[PDB]
């Protein structure tokens, strides 16, 4: 089939691993990731935020506006 035994050509690329037991699970797991998280963040907040903020603004836009077409009516309907 497409199983590992016969696939793409690949050559003199080499692997260096470690036995899981010989190494601890959390190698500087804190300090390394935070700048990464924050950089990914500053990377994509630019491309994620504006639809959602525009949505929130239209949300309160229509809610508050129509609400002003709603609660305020008796003066709008005059005496």
């Amino acid at each position: 089939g497409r199983e590992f035994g016969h696939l793409t050509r690949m050559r003199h690329v080499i692997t260096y691993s470690l036995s899981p037991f010989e190494q601890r699970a959390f190698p500087h797991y804190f300090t390394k990731g935070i700048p990464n998280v924050l950089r990914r963040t500053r990377a994509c907040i630019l491309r994620v935020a504006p639809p959602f903020v525009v949505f929130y603004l239209v949300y309160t836009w229509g809610t508050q506006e129509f609400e002003k077409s709603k609660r305020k009516n008796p003066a709008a309907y005059e005496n």
Binding site: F4, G5, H6, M10, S17, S19, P20, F21, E22
Partner: protein, 120 residues
């Protein structure tokens, strides 16, 4: 061959576990006899034994006499075999090396997975 890479492995680790649990004494004496033959076969000739003198001294010291070696082969029992094999084969981290192409060969954990039978 590329398509059977895992397969030899698939059996090989079992052999180690085979040595762990259920190591028949008949197999033990088989291995001992082949071992004794390996010694006597090594010790034919002048150069090999000059080397034996030339290395045994660096090792234990001594020429370590064959009467001792064969007393020490008679020394072995299947219980002791299963114990030592347990102390090295049964759950211990492999150090594996390959030059192929390798691709069928299982990744380390999977390889590591075989060092211990789930049944034991």
């Amino acid at each position: 061959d590329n398509m059977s890479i895992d397969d030899m492995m698939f059996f090989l680790q079992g052999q180690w576990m085979r040595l762990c649990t259920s190591a028949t004494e008949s197999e033990v004496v088989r291995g001992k006899n082949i071992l004794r033959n390996a010694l006597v076969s090594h010790l034919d000739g002048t150069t090999p034994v000059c080397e034996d003198i030339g290395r045994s001294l660096l090792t234990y010291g001594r020429r370590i006499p064959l009467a001792e070696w064969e007393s020490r082969i008679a020394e072995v029992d299947a219980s002791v075999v299963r114990e030592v094999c347990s102390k090295y084969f049964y759950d211990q981290c492999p150090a594996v090396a390959g030059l192929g192409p390798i691709e069928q060969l299982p990744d380390y954990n999977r390889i590591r997975s075989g060092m211990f039978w789930l049944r034991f």
